[PDB]
Enzyme design. Structure first.
Site: not given
Ligand SMILES: *[C@@H](C(=O)N[C@H](C(=O)N1CCC[C@H]1C(=O)OC)[C@@H](C)CC)[C@H](O)C(=O)NCCC
Length: 220
Positions: A19, A25, A86, A163, A187
């Site tokens: 990110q 996040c 994306e 987060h 993550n």
């Protein structure tokens, strides 16, 4: 429930993203959960546009690089009628005006499901649904420097999550303290952080870091 789950082995999980220096996040968490539920439906894993969420889901309550919620992101995909890939709407790590193009939409959803605020319900969701969006307290240096093992932070809060990440499974491994159970969490800080971008977060330790307090997934 199974004693170990890992949705990566079933093909529901794209590679680890980064990110950058934007507080987005929530957008990566949401795309992760929708990537999994889209794959569940169609059998095609397609990386989804976080930039699309960052730029465009303000009306649902999101604030771009200043934070957001995965549930608002799921509501945006349903309200909007789509979400771009994306590849078609690349990540820029800064908020810009909305450039969504329905022609390049590759995902949809019909709502979302919030999970009761207990680790037992999260486990059942992970076991039966696929990857789950969750919010955690990641605001400790220990989390920045995480390298391997089961992450446990005595000062972690179960009420003040900062987060958004993605539970892709859970499992166990023998430890010194015999607190052996972990959530397998993806993550969005790139592959260099943690174990190839993943963390094993303490499971069944009083909802450590609040991982079960704001868990949800999109309905496809
Ligand atoms: C979630 C978020 O983006 N968190 C944010 C973060 O990950 N970074 C800030 C700049 C680059 C990363 C980082 O720490 O890289 C090392 C911080 C605040 C986490 C410690 C966002 O704030 C949010 O929407 N939180 C609410 C829960 C979804």
């Amino acid at each position: 429930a199974p004693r170990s789950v890992d949705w990566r082995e079933k093909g529901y999980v794209t590679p680890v993203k980064n990110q950058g220096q934007c507080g987005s996040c929530w957008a990566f968490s949401a795309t992760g959960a929708l990537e999994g539920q889209m794959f569940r439906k169609t059998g095609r894993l397609i990386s989804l546009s976080e930039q699309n969420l960052v730029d465009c889901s303000g009306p649902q309550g999101n604030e771009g690089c200043n934070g957001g919620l995965m549930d608002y992101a799921f509501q945006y995909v349903q309200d909007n009628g789509g979400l771009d890939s994306e590849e078609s709407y690349p990540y820029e790590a800064t908020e810009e005006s909305c450039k969504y193009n329905p022609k390049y939409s590759v995902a949809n959803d019909a709502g979302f499901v919030d999970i009761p605020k207990q680790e037992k319900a999260l486990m059942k969701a992970v076991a039966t649904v696929g990857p789950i969006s969750v919010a955690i307290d990641a605001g400790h240096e220990s989390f920045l420097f995480y390298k391997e093992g089961i992450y446990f932070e005595p000062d972690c809060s179960s009420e003040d999550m900062d987060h958004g990440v993605l539970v892709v499974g859970y499992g166990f491994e023998s430890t010194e303290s015999d607190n052996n159970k972990y959530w397998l969490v993806k993550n969005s800080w790139g592959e260099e952080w943690g174990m190839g971008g993943y963390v094993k977060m303490a499971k069944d330790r009083r909802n450590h870091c609040g991982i079960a307090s704001a868990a949800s997934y999109p309905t496809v």
